Amino acid sequence: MGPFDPEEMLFIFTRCMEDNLEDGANRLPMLAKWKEWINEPVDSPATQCFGKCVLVRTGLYDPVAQKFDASVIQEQFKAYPSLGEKSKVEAYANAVKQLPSTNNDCAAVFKAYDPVHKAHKDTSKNLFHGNKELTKGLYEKLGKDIRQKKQSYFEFCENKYYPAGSDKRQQLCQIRQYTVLDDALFKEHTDCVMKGIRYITKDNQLDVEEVKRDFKLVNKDTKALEEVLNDCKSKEPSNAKEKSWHYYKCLVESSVKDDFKEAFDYREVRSQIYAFNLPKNQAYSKPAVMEIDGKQCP
């Protein structure tokens, strides 16, 4: 669901690498290539599924249609005119448009796209926030208005809604202790966070699989979580603005609250470096058990 900003592409690339990198000797060499948009080894199932993953998340390959979709290229260029030359973007979109219908397996999808990737590498890399120089520029222009590399997503949202130096900053003392506030500002902040860690989709829908992913990462079973979320969903408010807050509140107040806090805490840590698990997938152990900007909380 494009267009995608630099953080959104970063999320996609890092997630697809986390899910598809091999775990042995080939991990670091593979990572080093994929990071540079070198989709090799082409004969590797890991590379093939990594490539499929990225194509599916960006919408370049539609697994339901069983076809590639050049729409996202045009959407991306519309949003980021500085990131392409029209004739080159058109050439790239045309190559994708003319790919045949393709089966929804990693090998087929990867094999079909690979010639396009190679024939249009720089065009696609620039357009989808893969050019480090251009992307550095955009991050500098956006500053506080986009989550930055090496910045906790939670902190990004906190700074937006409860800025340092303001009379709002003090609320972080309660907020960071899982106090559920009721006001419009907190609902907006919670929307920022829930969407930033992908528990809520861009279209304001719950993604149960994302929540489950984080529970699993802190070594929890998810049966009770699914039961809780099913109950929460039956009481979803009609106001789209309040959906994220609704699920946050429901989780914090539920019979899975302790596991939720544990999972959410770990997610916060991992949100600070998107490539947290890339060099080697890190085992979780529960950390040892307040100040804001160095100022003690009451």
Binding residues for noradrenaline: 158, 176, 189, 265, 268
By beta-carbon proximity to Br ion, the closer residue of 97 and 241 is 97
CA–CA distance, 136 with 194 (Å, rounded to integer): 26
Q: Is 209 in the site for Br ion (CB under 5 A)?
A: no
Minimum distance of Br ion from residue 230's CB (angstroms): 6
Minimum distance of Br ion from residue 287's CB (angstroms): 20
Minimum distance of Br ion from residue 147's CB (angstroms): 9
Q: Is 128 in the site for Br ion (CB under 5 A)?
A: no
Residue 281 main-chain phi, psi, to 5 deg: -70, 110
Got the DSSP string for the chain? -----HHHHHHHHHHHHHHHS-SSTTHHHHHHHHTTT----TT-HHHHHHHHHHHHHHTSEETTTTEE-THHHHHHHHH-GGG--HHHHHHHHHHHHTSPP--SSHHHHHHHHHHHHHHTHHHHHHHTT--HHHHHHHHHHHGGGSPPTTS-HHHHHHHHHS-TTSTTGGGHHHHTTT----SHHHHHHHHHHHHHTTSB-TTS-B-HHHHHHHHHHTT---HHHHHHHHHHHTT--S-GGGHHHHHHHHHHTSTTHHHHHHHHHHHHHHHT-TTTTSSS-PPP-PPP--EETTEEP-
Q: Is 149 in the site for Br ion (CB under 5 A)?
A: yes
Residues 17-46 that bind Br ion (CB under 5 A): 26, 29-30, 40-42
**97 alpha-carbon distance from chain centroid:** 27
Residues 254-273 that bind Br ion (CB under 5 A): 273
Residues 54-73 that bind Br ion (CB under 5 A): 56
Question: Per DSSP, what are the bridge partners of residue 62?
Answer: 67
Of 226, 236, 253, 268, which lies in the binding site for Br ion, with binding defined by CB under 5 A?
A: 226
The binding site consists of 37, 130, 149, 158, 176, 189, 265, 268
Of 34, 68, 80, 264, which lies in the binding site for Br ion, with binding defined by CB under 5 A?
A: 80
By beta-carbon proximity to Br ion, the closer residue of 64 and 289 is 64
Minimum distance of Br ion from residue 274's CB (angstroms): 4
By beta-carbon proximity to Br ion, the closer residue of 13 and 186 is 13
By beta-carbon proximity to Br ion, the closer residue of 47 and 171 is 47
Q: Do 219 and 283 meet the contact criterion of CB atoms below 8 Å apart?
A: no
Minimum distance of Br ion from residue 238's CB (angstroms): 23
Question: Binding residues for Br ion, how many (CB under 5 A)?
Answer: 16
Minimum distance of Br ion from residue 76's CB (angstroms): 10
Stretch that binds Br ion, among 50-58, 163-171, 194-202, 216-224 (CB under 5 A): 50-58
By beta-carbon proximity to Br ion, the closer residue of 91 and 275 is 275
Minimum distance of Br ion from residue 55's CB (angstroms): 8
Q: Is 82 in the site for Br ion (CB under 5 A)?
A: yes
Stretch that binds Br ion, among 53-61, 117-125, 163-171, 174-182 (CB under 5 A): 53-61
CA–CA distance, 73 with 127 (Å, rounded to integer): 8
Residue 137: Cβ-neighbour burial (10 angstroms; 0-12, 13-18, 19+): middle
**Residues found near Br ion in the complex (CB under 5 A):** 26, 29-30, 40-42, 53, 56, 80, 82, 149, 226, 273-275, 278
